[PDB]
Amino acid sequence: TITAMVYGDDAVKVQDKAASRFNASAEAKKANAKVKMERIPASDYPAKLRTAMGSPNAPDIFFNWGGGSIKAYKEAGQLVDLTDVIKSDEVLSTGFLPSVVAAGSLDGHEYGIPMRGMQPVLLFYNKSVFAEHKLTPPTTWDQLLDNVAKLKKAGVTPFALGGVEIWPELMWLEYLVDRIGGPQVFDKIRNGDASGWGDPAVLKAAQTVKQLVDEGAFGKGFSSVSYNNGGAPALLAKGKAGMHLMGSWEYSTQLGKFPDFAKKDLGWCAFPSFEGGAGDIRNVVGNPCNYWSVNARTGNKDGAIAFLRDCASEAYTKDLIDNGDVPTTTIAENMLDSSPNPEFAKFQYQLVQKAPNFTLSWDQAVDPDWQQPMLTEINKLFVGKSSPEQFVSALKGL
Amino acid sequence: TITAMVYGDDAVKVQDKAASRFNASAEAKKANAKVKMERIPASDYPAKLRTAMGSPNAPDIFFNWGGGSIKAYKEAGQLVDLTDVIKSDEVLSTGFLPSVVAAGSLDGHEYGIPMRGMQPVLLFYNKSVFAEHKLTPPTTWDQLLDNVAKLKKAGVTPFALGGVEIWPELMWLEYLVDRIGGPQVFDKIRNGDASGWGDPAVLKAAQTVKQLVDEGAFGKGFSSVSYNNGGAPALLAKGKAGMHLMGSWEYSTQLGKFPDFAKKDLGWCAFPSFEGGAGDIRNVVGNPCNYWSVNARTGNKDGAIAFLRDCASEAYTKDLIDNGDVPTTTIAENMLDSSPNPEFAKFQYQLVQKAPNFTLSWDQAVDPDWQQPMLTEINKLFVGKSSPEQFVSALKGL
Ligand SMILES: O[C@@H]1[C@@H](O)[C@H](O[C@@H]2CO[C@@H](O)[C@H](O)[C@H]2O)OC[C@H]1O
């Protein structure tokens, strides 16, 4: 039994389908192995995984985002270096976009096999709401503000926001810092320099966020709305909100929970430009993918590799596409017209392919011991407990 | 039953004696436990420990230096947080100097039990050589360079130096940066800002090292001379070198290897002051102690804790003292009269108690993913492959 610890949101249905398919397979018989999904709820996944990895019953494979989400496990000797496994296995070697495999590497060694869709953060919107108020998707920050003022007036919350998890608030900072100051601002911080939080682009992003909040862009009480229980996506699908800045898994989430809305009334656009900003507007922030990594303590390394091969298969790729995701397998590009929404799938594939920079979600990119302290300070910014200068000063002390 | 992975230099005799004592004690049968030392050679200890921690046979407790030597294991969920264990257990609670327990801590949580001596780096010297050439230990850098010239004139290598391991070279940089720029210089770097390598004090120290190498202060073969096999201590004991900059375990090393020399002819002094420097001249660098940490996977935590209480005992304290170490147990200071050299033991105790700052060895203090590449660059500086400027630029690139 290969245990696979996985992030248990609605998307886990794809991995459930894969465990079933693999378990019934001849490659499985061959390695005398079955996979068992250990589903861990989204809301406390990083802590639960850490506890499990220190336990006698640590998972044989586990779900991650690369970067800071594996750096400690790797430094602690807990991971199998997959570089040679991937190189010598024909299916693994040619199975994924090389850029996505690189995003699951550390120090030039590959530690992840891609296992969900590419996940850039996009601006989604309700096309009904817009049509009713003669709004158009904003190509600039000033137009985004115009849209906020009109929705406010019309009694519609401009943006849905899952304040509870705090990382949905972080998304605003991520795009703002990149648009304003380009990718080198966060690169410096991610590499460990806390002084880097002193960059003027960070302060400008933090002030811009405060203005949005103070001026009602997220309404009142977003700090009590959750993304993970479906609350924030439902605000959008019911036309209680006009827009929603979210990882591209939002489309899948909408399709499964509100299919009528997702089919007819869900729109999308890139995060807008910001006047005077130095960042290339083609840059994206989010998650290049999610990855399986393999525990160095595992007793059936070959069984686990066998299951990992399935991640490159036509059947796995089709299951992702049918879910609303755009997979990172080499065969996916040629299969996008099979998507529930081929225009969206194609918009999303090319947005990522054209991006000069793809910045990993900050709470997954920073060193693990910064992840929570950082989200704590972001929440204090959003609820107005910290001024933008206090926010900067707190982070400089990490 | 409890495996203990330990750094296997000559000092490991004290831990073998502890295992013998514990395994024969009533406390060990009470806790249903025995301990087995898994001795790992000094030269590749951090790598072998990392491989073992990722193995199905990971040790129940293991030797470390605190700081970066545990940061990854802690972040990876591999350690028991000892804070409450320590607080609840009378013997552990009052058994150690609180400053030493703090230096086994991360993020305010205690992960280490002290288990060797306090280990400031000191300048040792051969008193027979110094008497023959009418030298006195240097209190300033100018006196040190006068001593360098006179010892060269006498045909004696001025400093023994174990170039092979590289960290004995690092000691020179550590005290030179601290004396020149103060502890703030390395604090900046340790906390993860690689641009901190650009501080003028780093370049000045690197320049200073180069000058020492170029003028023959370490003679010509030092890159092939080992500390861990005894080669560097032997050069001092035999009077082939006049001085040796080393962690205070050098006293114990000498007493074990060259007892007549250690009894009669070994001198010690603090690292000298430095003209033009800004660092507090009392500051020290080295290891506050070594620690046991406990694997979060351990099946018999109570057996492990019973062995850890021995580290606070009078017997373990006396075994350290008799070895030539100065223990960090609360019972130790009034027992230093039992030391093979009470004068030195007291000197060392006071030097550490008076130091405004005690910087952890850099290769143990920095994040584990910087440790070997930093040592690689220190080596290139000492053997002349990198100029001071190239050394600074390479380290900036970490
Ligand atoms: O920390 C945050 C992650 O929790 C978030 O994770 C994504 C949530 O949706 C799942 O369907 C995706 O697989 C998963 O990657 O990404 C944002 C990050 O800030």
Ligand SMILES: O[C@@H]1[C@@H](O)[C@H](O[C@@H]2CO[C@@H](O)[C@H](O)[C@H]2O)OC[C@H]1O
């Ligand atoms: O990385 C280096 C360590 O290997 C060195 O460790 C000391 C060696 O002597 C042993 O007797 C001590 O217990 C141990 O701490 O410390 C210096 C550091 O740079």
